[PDB]
């Protein structure tokens, strides 16, 4: 029920309240109003690295330096080749 930094009710799925904004040792759902103990929800740890693009600079850039084969149906079946030779114009397919 715990993903990221938010906790979802296991009965209905409404977003639960922020634990540190409720009286201790009990979390109550907003709609179905089930019983949720504040235990076992110890760490809402979320890490967030920057965009790796928010800091454009000069030193930043220095760490970055006729026949057709077609797949028709699915990845299992082999590729089918369609030839159309310019010598005569005769076109044909091959598997």
């Amino acid at each position: 029920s715990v993903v990221g930094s938010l906790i979802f009710c296991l009965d209905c799925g409404d977003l639960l309240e922020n634990p540190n904004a409720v009286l201790g040792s009990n979390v109550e759902c907003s709609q179905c109003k089930a019983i949720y103990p504040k235990s076992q929800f110890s760490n809402l740890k979320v890490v967030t690295t920057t965009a790796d693009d928010a800091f454009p600079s000069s030193l930043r850039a220095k760490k970055s330096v006729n026949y057709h084969t077609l797949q028709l149906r699915s990845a299992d079946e082999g590729a089918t080749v369609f030839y159309t030779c310019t010598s005569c114009g005769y076109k044909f397919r091959t598997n």
Partner: protein, 172 residues
């Protein structure tokens, strides 16, 4: 906004445009560009899409550019990977040009946006509605006539003449 663009190849005439105030704004169609005027029968397409490998969106549990969203006329139909999305896009083109399957109209525009690094949002889109801009190109397999649109065109390679065809990179 007045610039001539490579996307208008075959739809807007590069030459026919008044000189002066209306330059770039008032332009004309290419002489073989037929504008769609009636909805194509896109009723059977979701069924054949499911057979190809599309996973129906009703019970999929998927989202994001990491998967290929398969949509029709502005309605999500399924979620299949980018590789299989390209496979089914080419399959749909082949079946639509080879006018055997009844569920695929010849005017079905197949806009496939493959994954790219910070490019356009990927996914498979199918259009069959009114007012679309369509032009006839020659599908090189089967050596037949295909109809393409501006959205569908900017990702596939159409040789301007058969003498300039290259292997494995040109399909029209």
């Amino acid at each position: 906004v007045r610039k001539l663009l490579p996307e208008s190849w075959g739809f807007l005439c590069p030459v026919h445009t008044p000189d002066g105030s209306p330059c770039g704004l008032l332009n004309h169609f290419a002489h073989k560009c037929r504008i769609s005027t009636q909805q194509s029968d896109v009723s059977r397409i979701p069924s054949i899409l499911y057979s190809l490998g599309v996973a129906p969106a009703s019970h999929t549990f998927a989202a994001g550019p990491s998967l290929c969203c398969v949509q029709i006329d502005g309605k999500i139909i399924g979620w299949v990977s980018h590789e299989q999305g390209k496979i089914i896009a080419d399959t749909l083109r082949y079946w639509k040009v080879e006018g055997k399957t009844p569920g695929l109209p010849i005017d079905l525009e197949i806009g496939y946006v493959p994954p790219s690094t910070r490019g356009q949002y990927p996914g498979l889109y199918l259009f069959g509605g009114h007012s679309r801009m369509l032009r006839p190109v020659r599908y090189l397999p089967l050596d037949k006539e295909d109809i393409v649109g501006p959205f569908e065109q900017v990702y596939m390679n159409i040789a301007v003449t058969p003498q300039e065809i290259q292997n494995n990179v040109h399909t029209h």
